């Protein structure tokens, strides 16, 4: 009965990231899509993928997304957001987060 989405508060473009998605109390399997759209306009699909979540895996998942900064048209002059989304059987979740252009060290 409880579906959770935890992602990093701030997501690094052109750098892999991992987000936590859980089902609390629901021993019946599932197959969900992970979607990320530019905020606020939802103009383009930045990242899409699909994962199965079964009882074996504790009923949770660690999908790895990866926004390409090649798809962020903004400059570093103001804080541009992107929005996370999960959808499937008896579930949907939606979370807006901030984006870092960080490359490296």
Curated annotation (Swiss-Prot):
Name of this protein: Cobra venom factor alpha chain
Domain of life assignment = Eukaryota
Organism, per UniProt? Answer: Naja kaouthia
Please tell me where this chain falls within the complete protein, as first and last residue plus total length: 23 to 127 of 1642
